[PDB]
Amino acid sequence: PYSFVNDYSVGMHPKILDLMARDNMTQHAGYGQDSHCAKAARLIGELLERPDADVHFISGGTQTNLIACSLALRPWEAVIATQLGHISTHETGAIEATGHKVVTAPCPDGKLRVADIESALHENRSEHMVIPKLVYISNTTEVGTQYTKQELEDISASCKEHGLYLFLDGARLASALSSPVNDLTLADIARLTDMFYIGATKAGGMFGEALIILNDALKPNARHLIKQRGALMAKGWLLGIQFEVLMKDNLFFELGAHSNKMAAILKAGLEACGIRLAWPSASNQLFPILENTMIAELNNDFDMYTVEPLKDGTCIMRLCTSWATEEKECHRFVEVLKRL
Amino acid sequence: PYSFVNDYSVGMHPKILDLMARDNMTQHAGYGQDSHCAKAARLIGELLERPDADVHFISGGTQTNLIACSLALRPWEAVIATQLGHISTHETGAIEATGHKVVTAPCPDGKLRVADIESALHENRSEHMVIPKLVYISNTTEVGTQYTKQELEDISASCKEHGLYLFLDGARLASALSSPVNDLTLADIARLTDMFYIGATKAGGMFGEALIILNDALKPNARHLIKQRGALMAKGWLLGIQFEVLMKDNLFFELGAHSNKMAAILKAGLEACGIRLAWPSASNQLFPILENTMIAELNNDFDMYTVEPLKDGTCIMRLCTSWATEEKECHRFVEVLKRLVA
Amino acid sequence: PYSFVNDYSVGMHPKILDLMARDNMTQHAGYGQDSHCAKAARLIGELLERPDADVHFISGGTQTNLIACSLALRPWEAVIATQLGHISTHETGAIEATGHKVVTAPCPDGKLRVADIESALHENRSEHMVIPKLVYISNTTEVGTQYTKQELEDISASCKEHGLYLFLDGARLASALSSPVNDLTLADIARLTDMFYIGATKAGGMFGEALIILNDALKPNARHLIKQRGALMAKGWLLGIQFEVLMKDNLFFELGAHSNKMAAILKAGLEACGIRLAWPSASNQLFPILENTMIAELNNDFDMYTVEPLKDGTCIMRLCTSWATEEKECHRFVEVLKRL
Amino acid sequence: PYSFVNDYSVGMHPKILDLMARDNMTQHAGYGQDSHCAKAARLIGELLERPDADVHFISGGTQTNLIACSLALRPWEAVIATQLGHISTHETGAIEATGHKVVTAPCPDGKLRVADIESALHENRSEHMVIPKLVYISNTTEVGTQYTKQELEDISASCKEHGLYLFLDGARLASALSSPVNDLTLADIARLTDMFYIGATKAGGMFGEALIILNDALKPNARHLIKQRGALMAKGWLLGIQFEVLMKDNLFFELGAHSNKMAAILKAGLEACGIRLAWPSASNQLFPILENTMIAELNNDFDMYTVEPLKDGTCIMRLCTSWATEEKECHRFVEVLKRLVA
Structure with a gap:
């Protein structure tokens, strides 16, 4: 019975398995302080044309989303997302468990527009309501659609005008950026967002997300927060290896x-x-x-x-x-x- | 310019102020362990016809809502409410700050119905979604409508069928139960809910909400939680005095x-x-x-x-x-x- | 049976009761936006010789402490206090309920010293431990002792050198600043701390604490947080009245x-x-x-x-x-x- | 330079790597609902002699500790631990970030004793203090000592007397139970605790902790909580494979x-x-x-x-x-x- 159920039913690409096998029995420092993570992070900085960015390797998507929001939000601040966004539906209240509200917008095609951001800001006012501060989008989205460059440029501009952080969930970024209707590159995303992640789990790795932090204000002590939420993997060079193989040679x-x-x-x-x-x-x-x-x-x-x-x-x-x-x-x- | 802005623009009913004046300089035990809170709690018990109910005096409505959700919910559980509910809009994410999600239903007249509860339970399934466990209603609602006894009985029975707790926000319970269209008593509300509160702030008191806990599983160590959220007022007898006057002689x-x-x-x-x-x-x-x-x-x-x-x-x-x-x-x-x- | 059990067994000073009685039936805007709060806050600014400070009226001490810590701390940051501090013992985990650790120091006389701050900083290092960021002291302390001016000056200087906020809990500040061994004024405290509060509950009011925020970084949107924690009292002019009477004429x-x-x-x-x-x-x-x-x-x-x-x-x-x-x-x- | 820094410097035992290699390209259901996790869970059940235990596979030790505290504690409850315990020191306040206090005891050799538990219960009283409800121990401890069977039986009986849950952190359980001074088996630990975990990260696996829940009151909807804290790994069969190899043939x-x-x-x-x-x-x-x-x-x-x-x-x-x-x-x-x- 052949499965089309999801994009994470097989372990990993053979070239990842090969590097993991050939690297076995070498000694490594823990918690991402190793050679593999350093090489992967360098490769990613070059592809983004933002070698100033901080790159942190984390094992899962829900983990990464709840860390991103917890890094970007004060206790009375909230995140804007579509009703179909992964953080609004399918993380069993993960964001709310960090203490923050997800303000949703009804976007039937799974994509946020500038008018939904603006409307979410209009509706939440005064000291009696949350302050929206972070916008969450997914590329591709949870219903298989995706953003064009002009759309992301419009969203990014609106976020800068209103003092919002922009976070892009790239669980399925490989699919998005390889599609024939796509006109975004990784460099465009790095230019237009405050933070995003590149998913390996659904794109060839057995696990791993690369959380990229571009906005200088979000960077400090991110590893403390990753540790606190249980996401600082001890044998972290194994996450680095995923990306060292995947981000090499296209x-x-x-x-x-x-x-x-x-x-x-x-x-x-x-x-x-x-x-x-x-x-x-x-x-x-x-x-x-x-x-x-x-x-x-x-x-x-x-x-x-x-x-x-x-x-x-x-x-x-x-x-x-x-x-x-x-x-x-x-x-x-x-x-x-x-x-x- | 005369104000019609809200129902908390004036301090307190003269009879409450009179008791506070006569009582002043008398020594009392703190944190609601005093005589006035004991008397208020007893009067409330008799109006509800449930002397076994735990009554806790708390200063404000947001305070009360956040304590009630925290008592009733495990970390992966959630509260169902209308989009116009106080906890969905006007609490600066107080429920979310306790770690819980508010699952909303679009109800243009501010009233939850059984179909809304059912539809919330259908949409939220599997280990990948929150489990709705508490239902939140307001009487009167935030748009001035209110529930009949039949509406509340249907909501209540659906909750018993699906294993949900029902909590009623009575910020404006005085106006609701004195209205010509009303057929509910306090006894009814006590019979049909696991928890509710009677608001004094908007009905004559300078502050005060009386949180009534009826379901026995919600009762234990509630005072520890009230303390933790900063809601266990030191001079608690002053909250008690509000209700000792308001709940006397109708x-x-x-x-x-x-x-x-x-x-x-x-x-x-x-x-x-x-x-x-x-x-x-x-x-x-x-x-x-x-x-x-x-x-x-x-x-x-x-x-x-x-x-x-x-x-x-x-x-x-x-x-x-x-x-x-x-x-x-x-x-x-x-x-x-x-x-x-x- | 006459009670010496605590300092909050009687309702309020007659002059507060009188102003509350004579003011009854006047219409006021809610949530501290009224004339009484404005006058009390102005009076307090003058006594502190810091009219630039923000003053927020809040009903209780535990409320005020958990709001102060939640305002000053990121998720991976912690507060330093003595083991006898109110937040370490007698708030039933209120600070931890906001998501933060209290790092305690064993100070038998109830007073923090520079050496305890320094030692708390030495012990908590690396991404695997919390970052101490806020220091909590009480004047008077929970065992009836109190700080001298030189002590508070030493603590304040050490906090500035290490980038820590300094918060003083003034539940019993009236007693402290009226004692014959005291050489601090309110103006000194305002000079030396980032935030503190003046307690009315134990000093003549039926309730009320005046949270003073001096550090410009801690000020923004404080009222949102107060609201979120259930502390934004609707009839807030009644808290203002406490202070309007107490802070007048000594x-x-x-x-x-x-x-x-x-x-x-x-x-x-x-x-x-x-x-x-x-x-x-x-x-x-x-x-x-x-x-x-x-x-x-x-x-x-x-x-x-x-x-x-x-x-x-x-x-x-x-x-x-x-x-x-x-x-x-x-x-x-x-x-x-x-x-x- | 050869490293003696820690027990997680090398990837995984060659036999685990061999199974992952042979298994690669086979399709599996996600989130631990697969065949390898089922087999691992069964082997574990038989080593403990408790096939009724719920076994959950989770990636890391900090992750496991924070989930376990969150399962066992209400908001005003707390965990008792030594000052040297992992959750008191080296988790960046992970337990506090779930809303709970860690009450510590000064135990210079890293081992909790009954007198410490008792003294924690005496110091923490009234509605103004947390209620200790969970006891946390580590075997081996963070300073390399370890518990005998008699020590664990006394701790366990004190917990039953006072209505506390007992949770054992087995990050280094492989070293502990293979030591010459040891007289505990996995069966014993299962008998005397409500919850514990077996660590693979430090005992041959590339990652993996097996959380065993034994007390029935802690079991329901645990998977919802694991999901919420970001610990429900998508390709969960890979955690399972770690234990399917490690728990076979001693x-x-x-x-x-x-x-x-x-x-x-x-x-x-x-x-x-x-x-x-x-x-x-x-x-x-x-x-x-x-x-x-x-x-x-x-x-x-x-x-x-x-x-x-x-x-x-x-x-x-x-x-x-x-x-x-x-x-x-x-x-x-x-x-x-x-x-x-x-």
């Missing part, structure tokens, strides 16, 4: 390109069969609307994620591809689908 | 009836002038939609709250009466309004 | 002088009977060591606080006087004691 | 025995050279008091941790061995030390 983007090419095969198949997607997609996620009878038959050969059942005898399903997805399985899916 | 409900009656004079003046209200009201709050040019002239004689500017050259205002509101000011508002409209 | 200090004169009568009586105090005192608190048999007999006519029973058939008791203490009761205590 | 205890044996060579060299240890040790940590001039020469060949400079021109150092420590480096340390002393 691998990160080549794997991203593959995941998007796989999803494009599924999408061409879906569209040839008259099946509609709930959101537009040029990334590694698809949200087909399939009849329940068809789903029960597809379940015999593929695992999918159920997003939301609907009253008219259909569900929104999610298909997810990754760096590890077998092209042959994508063509099989389409062939099985055509015959249903 | 004074609480008589002050509420006065506040509702003053609002009824304002409401009659507004309705004779063709001015519409943004929400229905039989309580102490009114939300007239008025012309901006009208507002600028009213402003010379009266102070009102500005709720929501609209595109079409008008504005939703709030008028609020209290136990202290003067009838002659109410008639005067109506009369200035008729001169303006004509 | 009343605060005259009441403080009376509480110290009362304790001096008790102390002269104790010392004439050969009874030792557990700490030196020139303030409104005494800590006599009395035999258990003598305590049972004194309990017939006076209520006292039991501090710590001891194995040799004695207890450390606390006697507390205030602005409201009846001189006749103090002479009675001494007369009863002499005859035991 | 490998966990064999690696611990190797680590203790290497330390015994170092300890013998130190004792033949007249050098004293700051605490007694039969585990993988040693705390020699050495001359500063000695240290500067040793530094050219070896890396050690500096614990505490002393006034008299000497210094307490820490030496730490692990499953990966080379015997030839141990003999070499002893030999360089004898040349230096002579």
